[PDB]
Amino acid sequence: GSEGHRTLASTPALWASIPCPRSELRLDLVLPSGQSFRWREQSPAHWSGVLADQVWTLTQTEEQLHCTVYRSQASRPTPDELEAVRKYFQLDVTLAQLYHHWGSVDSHFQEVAQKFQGVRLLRQDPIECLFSFICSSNNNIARITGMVERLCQAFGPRLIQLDDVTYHGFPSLQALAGPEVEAHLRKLGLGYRARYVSASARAILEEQGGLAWLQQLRESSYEEAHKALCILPGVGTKVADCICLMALDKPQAVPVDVHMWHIAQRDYSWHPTTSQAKGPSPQTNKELGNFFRSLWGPYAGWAQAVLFSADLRQ
DNA sequence: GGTAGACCTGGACGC
DNA sequence: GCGTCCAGTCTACC
Ligand SMILES: Nc1nc2c(c(=O)[nH]1)=NC(=O)N=2
Ligand SMILES: [Ca+2]
């Protein structure tokens, strides 16, 4: 009862609610869709993970978003802690207004958005986002998720233990820059990305001015931010866009991957026009990104998550 | 400036 | 069962 992962039903007195209609958020579509790789549905309809250096389990009813925190006597999430949840899911942004707009300007979006509502963008931590996506290239969500777990367990602070699951905070820059980190990461199966992780942690801390340099990009322009990130090892056009969209408040950033190319070709009959290549290339990928922005507007990155997410269901 | 491989890993085909 | 295919970044020519 007092042990293991909690459920709304099993530990009633231990959950606080946040008004949130499923029309504004569908956890089952946001948490396992490749935005963040640290949430697990440990029990049906309940998702557990680390949010703001604390462990949480979240579940939702038709109109409520139920939250519970494990921190020292077990209490309820305070309205302050709940605020941390509101910021993570950027609940101030009205998903219904964006959907309305996108659907208005894009008949196909309208058609798809009808079956996949509640897909919004999480506002992630720069460091976690950076290395998680460095791990994402030329890889599948299943592996990435495992890789990111082993990584946090090996270099991240130990938080708390539920059942046989020990949660860890995300590794720090200093830890990731440590000696023999790449070697360790390889035995952990990160493949060649093991080097990227080490090299980018080192480069940030020893050549760019550390954490402040990264956090500063949030106030910077999208074009500036994306440009800066490309500097780092293992960070190409897509990874950079993922970071700008999900961690740097650059809502118009559109990550162009294999998924978005398929969608573009199949659902909009798109073809590169200012480029000679007919397939993915640095030129055509940049163009496709412009195409979606021109299609959905300032929040192109968010609209993207809707179709991307719905494309995963296949 | 603009392209062909090379690079870890492992679930998913296909024969 | 074994050999592909598939889920981006980087680099060596052209
Ligand atoms: N275009 C995208 N590429 C992604 C992604 C996402 O939400 N959009 N998650 C991910 O791991 N790769
Ligand atoms: Ca590919």
Domain boundaries along the sequence of chain A: 1-89, 93-113+254-312, 125-250
Strands A40-43 and A46-51, sheet pairing: antiparallel
Give nucleotides in strand B with any atom < 7 A to a protein C-beta. 2-3, 7-11
| Cα atoms in the Cβ-side hemisphere of radius 13 Å centred on A215 | 7
Give the number of other Cβ atoms within 10 Å of residue A164's Cβ. Answer: 6
Sign of CA dihedral A175, A179, A185, A190: positive
Place of tokens 């209490």: A75
Q: How many helices (H) and strands (E) does chain A have?
A: 15, 7
Q: Tell me, in angstroms, the distance from the centre of ligand 2 to residue A255's CA.
A: 14
- What is the phi/psi pair of residue A54, to 5°? -135, 155
- Torsion on CA atoms A103, A109, A111, A112, rounded to nearest 10: -130
Domain range A93-113+254-312, CATH architecture:
Orthogonal Bundle (1.10)
Tokens encoding A92: 């101030």
Q: Tell me, in angstroms, the distance from the centre of ligand 1 to residue A239's CA.
A: 9
Q: Whose CA is nearest to atom 1 of ligand 1?
A: A255
Q: Tell me, in angstroms, the distance from the centre of ligand 2 to residue A22's CA.
A: 34
The amino acid present at A30, given as its one-letter code, is V
Strand extents, DSSP E, chain A: 16-19, 40-43, 46-51, 54-60, 64-70, 158-162, 165-168
Q: Which of A35, A143, A246 to mutate to test the pocket of ligand 1 (most atoms within 8 A of CB)?
A: A35
The amino acid present at A166, given as its one-letter code, is T
- What is the phi/psi pair of residue A147, to 5°? -55, -45
List A67's β-bridge partners, or say none: A16, A58
Which SS3 state, helix, strand or coil, does residue A49 take?
Answer: strand
Which SS3 state, helix, strand or coil, does residue A183 take?
Answer: helix
The candidate with the shortest Cα–Cα distance to A17, out of A68, A74, A51, is A68
Among left, alpha and beta (phi > 0; psi -120 to 50; other), residue A146 is alpha
Report CA Rg, chain A.
20
Q: What is the spatial distance between Cα A240 and Cα A254, in angstroms, rounded to a whole number?
A: 10
Experimental method: X-ray
Measuring alpha carbon to C1', the residue closest to nucleotide B4 is: A281
Domain A125-250 CATH assignment equals 1.10.340.30: yes
Non-local (6+) Cβ contacts of A53 within 8 A are A159, A169
**Can you spell out the DSSP letters for A248-260?**
S--TT-----HHH
Give nucleotides in strand C with any atom < 7 A to a protein C-beta. 6-10
Q: Tell me, in angstroms, the distance from the centre of ligand 2 to residue A212's CA.
A: 33
Measuring alpha carbon to C1', the residue closest to nucleotide B7 is: A192
Non-local (6+) Cβ contacts of A111 within 8 A are none
Q: How far is the CA of A249 from the C1' of B7 (A)?
A: 32
Q: What is the spatial distance between Cα A91 and Cα A112, in angstroms, rounded to a whole number?
A: 22
DSSP state of A311: H
Distances (CA, A) of A86 to A67, A149, A160, A280: 11, 24, 23, 37
CATH fold of the domain at A1-89: TATA-Binding Protein (3.30.310)
Sign of CA dihedral A220, A223, A224, A228: positive
Place of tokens 């440590």: A178
Q: What is the resolution of this structure in A?
A: 2.3
Q: Which atom of ligand 1 is nearest to the CA of A254?
A: 1
- Residues contacting nucleic strand B by the 7 Å CB criterion are A 138-140, 142-143, 186, 189-193, 195, 275-277, 281-283
Q: Which of A129, A139, A254, A257 to mutate to test the pocket of ligand 1 (most atoms within 8 A of CB)?
A: A257
What is the length of chain A?
Answer: 314
Q: What is the spatial distance between Cα A216 and Cα A228, in angstroms, rounded to a whole number?
A: 11
Does residue A286 carry a catalytic annotation?
no
**Can you spell out the DSSP letters for A73-132?**
---PPPHHHHHHHHHHTTTTS-HHHHHHHHHHH-HHHHHHHTTS---------HHHHHHH
Which SS3 state, helix, strand or coil, does residue A182 take?
Answer: helix
Distances (CA, A) of A272 to A2, A68, A237, A288: 58, 48, 17, 7
Which SS3 state, helix, strand or coil, does residue A159 take?
Answer: strand
